[PDB]
Structure formats: C-alpha cells, structure tokens
C-alpha cells in the first residue's frame, strides 16, 4: 500500500520519457530532437575537456 505513490509516479515518468512529437494534431514519426539539457551536457563535457 505504501509504494503505490512510486508505482503511479514511475508509470507517469516512463510515459514522459518516451514523449512523442505531434505534427499539428497528428503525430510525426521518426522525429528526434536534442533537448536543452542534453545540449548543455554536451557543452559542459566539451568545455571540461578543453579546460583539461
């Protein structure tokens, strides 16, 4: 009864991780975007190696 919070949360987060991209109202498939978090981690990695 006490891990029901985490199982409903992980269902929501697992649906959120594979979030899909819509054309207008219909879905575009084979669409891959680079997030601002992923781009900032790329920038931080490249910046740390050049500082090294």
Partner 1 sequence: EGNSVAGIIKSVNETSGANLLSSLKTIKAQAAPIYPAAASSTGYSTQAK
| Residues near 37 by beta carbon (within 8 Å), at least 6 away in sequence | none
Nearer to partner 1, 27 or 43 (CB): 43
Nearest approach in angstroms of CB 52 to partner 1 is 4
Q: Does residue 16 bind partner 1 (CB under 8 A)?
A: no
39 phi/psi in degrees, rounded to 5: -65, -35
- In this chain, which of 17, 23, 29, 52 binds partner 1, going by CB under 8 A? 52
Q: For residue 28, which of 19, 37, 36 has the smallest C-alpha distance? A: 19
Binding site for partner 1 (CB under 8 A): 48-49, 51-52
């Amino acid at each position: 009864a006490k891990n029901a919070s985490e199982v409903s949360e992980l269902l929501a987060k697992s649906l959120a991780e594979k979030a899909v991209v819509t054309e207008g109202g219909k879905v575009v498939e084979g669409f891959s975007y680079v997030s601002k978090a992923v781009a900032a981690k790329v920038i931080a990695t490249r910046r740390a190696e050049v500082h090294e």
